Amino acid sequence: YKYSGRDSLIFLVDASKAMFESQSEDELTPFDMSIQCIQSVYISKIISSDRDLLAVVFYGTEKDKNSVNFKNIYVLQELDNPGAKRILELDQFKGQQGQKRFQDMMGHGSDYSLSEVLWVCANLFSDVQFKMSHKRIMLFTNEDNPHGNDSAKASRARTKAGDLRDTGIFLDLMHLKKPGGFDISLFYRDIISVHFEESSKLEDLLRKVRAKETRKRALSRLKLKLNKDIVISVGIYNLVQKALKPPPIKLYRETNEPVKTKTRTFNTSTGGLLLPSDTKRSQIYGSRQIILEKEETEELKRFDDPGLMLMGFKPLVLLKKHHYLRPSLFVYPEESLVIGSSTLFSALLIKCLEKEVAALCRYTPRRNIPPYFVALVPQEEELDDQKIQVTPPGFQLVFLPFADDKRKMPFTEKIMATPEQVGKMKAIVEKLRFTYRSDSFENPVLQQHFRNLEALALDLMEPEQAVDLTLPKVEAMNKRLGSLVDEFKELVYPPDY
């Protein structure tokens, strides 16, 4: 879908006693399972996408809250952006005492009707003003025949859920270990888009996974001036960009209210609230003072207008991988401007890969920025993983240093090791062989930070303290490697350290 549309998601639990207070074991509880799910996807969505909408609803309860079509349904929460007080409302109903806390309020086991329940949720999504990209309902019921004993009750539901799917709201399901069996082919076969224990999907809602997830958006758009005249529009996209702990919002102590930092400039002698025109900019050199205006400290540092000028072609081997400037950015075509320029770009991509070549360009991302120099290395897609595109096809902008960047480094000379000293090393190295994958690690600080932040947010008992994956697991490095550190200590240097 288009950029702005929120994900929006409504959670809809069976309040019926026959599941709600029920267990075959003692070790879980289907309502305590669903509520855990709702709290846990919801705490995922809080860290990861505060912009996307959640609601939660109980059907078949005995005391009601709805706009209309009231009987035996209670909207615990209408659609809203997610936060702490909503997670505290769900927390109240959890656990052995929780399954009594709920009973003092909304009441349990009464008759219900899916064609009314699906009506209610529909009205909910309608009532909200925002643009929605995905509209999804989640069923937390075990009741595999949903009391369609009256087939002329049940045909209402099936038609109404035809109407859900027809209006482009989706609906989705989880089965919840009903004693002895559950089978979708009896009923729910036509409500969703051979026999089950409990859903292999449901564990994915307990991943508790944390990052920002920020959708595909351009960094900027530019014209690749091949010369004085021929241009194509290309995008500039950010495939790799270091995340930061979110900017902290300064607060008033006594009320927790946000407060304005409200800075001004004031003359050291006098009451002049000096305006931006009152003051210049300056330097000191050679015991004299150089004076420039607030226009020209940024008229200096101009050279060009936003674009990409072509500078001619190179071998890919001469672009030496030791000197690297800043993270590489992707280039991909954009018919939003320069229509049909995709036809040129695609031929340019295809044929550079045959030539074993890069294009060299000069690059300005904005007006009032100096040109850097950038090699456009061409790119090719590994769809072989059943069209999981690990690599998009296009170009990489790889940046190149200038003289000033390549800092001087001290004198040293040696070519010291013998073939035995390499030969022992060639063993330890081959014993320590693993497979790195790009996603195999996580930031120890930024992951810890969210766990501290949750403890403070919910008033939990404890910070979760989940230990990081960057420390070497040194006992495994002792054992897999084995004792071979002694080959350095014996064969390579004296015993004095």
Partner: peptide, 23 residues
Amino acid sequence: RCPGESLINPGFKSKKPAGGVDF
């Protein structure tokens, strides 16, 4: 389609479970 797309956060690709060094 389903195979790579997360149920917690749709359209976005499924976050695999952290890994680290193991031989």
